Amino acid sequence: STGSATTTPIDSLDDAYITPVQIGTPAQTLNLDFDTGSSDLWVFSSETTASEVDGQTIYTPSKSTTAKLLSGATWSISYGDGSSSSGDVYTDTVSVGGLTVTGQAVESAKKVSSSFTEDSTIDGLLGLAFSTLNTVSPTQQKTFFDNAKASLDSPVFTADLGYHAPGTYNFGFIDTTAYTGSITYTAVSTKQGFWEWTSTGYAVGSGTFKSTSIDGIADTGTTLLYLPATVVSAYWAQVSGAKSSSSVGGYVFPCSATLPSFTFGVGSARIVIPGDYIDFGPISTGSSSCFGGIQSSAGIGINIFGDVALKAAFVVFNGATTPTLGFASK
Ligand SMILES: COc1cccc2c1CNC2
Ligand SMILES: COc1cccc2c1CNC2
């Protein structure tokens, strides 16, 4: 089997991407944030504290003839920004782009933190990291991809995020029309439960490529590109007036600037992020200071190849017995 679903930016900045997912019988369609940096499929639901729902579409398990409470199971998760959610668990039928999993753990939110409430466009998350990170207790649950894998034509999914435009998540096959050149594959460590890999270096604009190993994670659920302070300083030094602002929380730059591109290495291959992808717009409405899309990882403890990087590539998440990642230009 295979599946194919369109993923759409939630706003004009590509702050996140939502993909429609069918849950239950009859189907209830929710728009979920596919997150290769976590491993829980959780949704706003009829159980979510009412004051914490503000426009999201909710899953109502009582209206699904295939929903079954997973007795005794609870979940609770905290994300990189300090946001969080928690609740109980059902199993139900879940379909993505024509690919159906029965008995998928659907984690029903009883509580969500303010950043989730305030984003009416995201009805939940669909985790695509390794199932060892799933937070369900006392019986850990498998991700949608893990549950589908044996049925797929090939044990893979691909992320093809758009720049200010829709893109695609495919399950079970590699669309050879979706990229240019060849896909370069690189080793993955699953020891932290992430799609963790080592980039071979970087270049800023038309500058020379610096060969240096940068370990990081391929994370569709993080907006920006977080890299070591040395790398990020080298990038923003090429932008007149750019500076790191503690009050804003990162590098900012004059909105009048034209940003240089940023290249990262995948083995001997190179992925080029155009400068426009690094512009995240005014820090507040009407400001002439703009927020940068490349930021320091120094406070985070890990480098993160988020959407800014991933959207410049066609990305293969290969879930074979020995997982690997593939990147192609497009
Ligand atoms: C602080 O941010 C982190 C840190 C570790 C792992 C992840 C994130 C975001 N998604 C996965
Ligand atoms: C992984 O996705 C995350 C992570 C943290 C906070 C938020 C999202 C989506 N909107 C708020």
Side-chain angles (χ1 to χ4, degrees), residues 1-62 64-67 69-109 112-141 143-190 192-242 244-330:
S1 64
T2 62
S4 182
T6 299
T7 193
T8 302
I10 64 166
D11 62 23
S12 67
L13 300 179
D14 298 348
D15 282 314
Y17 298 76
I18 48 173
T19 308
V21 175
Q22 282 68 50
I23 309 174
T25 308
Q28 300 180 39
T29 296
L30 275 66
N31 296 325
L32 305 189
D33 185 345
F34 283 24
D35 181 12
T36 63
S38 66
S39 305
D40 288 50
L41 195 174
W42 73 260
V43 299
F44 278 80
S45 72
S46 61
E47 303 180 330
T48 309
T49 302
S51 64
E52 299 179 345
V53 185
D54 183 11
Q56 295 81 9
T57 295
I58 61 170
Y59 170 61
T60 304
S62 65
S64 171
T65 57
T66 43
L69 177 74
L70 187 60
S71 183
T74 60
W75 62 281
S76 179
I77 190 166
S78 290
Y79 295 100
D81 63 334
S83 69
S84 63
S85 50
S86 61
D88 55 17
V89 187
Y90 295 82
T91 59
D92 210 338
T93 302
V94 170
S95 301
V96 175
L99 173 66
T100 298
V101 167
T102 58
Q104 174 64 45
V106 178
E107 304 173 33
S108 168
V112 309
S113 65
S114 60
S115 65
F116 290 112
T117 300
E118 291 163 1
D119 184 8
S120 66
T121 71
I122 291 174
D123 301 325
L125 268 58
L126 190 148
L128 294 166
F130 295 87
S131 290
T132 54
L133 294 176
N134 175 265
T135 78
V136 178
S137 180
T139 306
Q140 188 176 58
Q141 300 295 304
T143 67
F144 175 82
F145 177 56
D146 215 328
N147 281 323
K149 190 182 289 163
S151 299
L152 296 175
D153 292 358
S154 183
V156 304
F157 68 89
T158 64
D160 180 10
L161 304 179
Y163 168 68
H164 295 171
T168 304
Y169 280 103
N170 290 331
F171 291 83
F173 72 105
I174 287 164
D175 181 355
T176 61
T177 74
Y179 59 88
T180 64
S182 59
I183 304 179
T184 298
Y185 288 86
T186 198
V188 162
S189 176
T190 67
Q192 300 186 282
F194 301 117
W195 292 92
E196 191 170 359
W197 66 289
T198 301
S199 172
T200 49
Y202 69 97
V204 177
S206 60
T208 58
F209 185 84
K210 174 76 171 179
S211 292
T212 185
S213 293
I214 303 172
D215 178 290
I217 62 163
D219 184 1
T220 58
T222 290
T223 311
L224 307 185
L225 172 52
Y226 294 87
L227 291 172
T230 50
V231 179
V232 178
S233 181
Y235 176 83
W236 289 109
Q238 297 304 312
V239 177
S240 291
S244 183
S245 167
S246 46
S247 61
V248 178
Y251 280 89
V252 296
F253 67 94
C255 291
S256 59
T258 302
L259 295 176
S261 61
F262 184 89
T263 300
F264 64 95
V266 184
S268 56
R270 308 286 178 254
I271 298 295
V272 178
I273 304 172
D276 289 347
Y277 290 28
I278 301 167
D279 181 356
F280 280 74
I283 60 170
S284 300
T285 306
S287 180
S288 71
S289 290
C290 273
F291 197 71
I294 295 179
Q295 298 291 345
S296 176
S297 65
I300 298 174
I302 195 171
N303 299 311
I304 305 175
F305 295 86
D307 296 339
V308 159
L310 302 181
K311 76 177 75 176
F314 177 88
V315 189
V316 180
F317 292 79
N318 170 26
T321 309
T322 296
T324 64
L325 280 168
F327 293 82
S329 298
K330 68 191 185 183

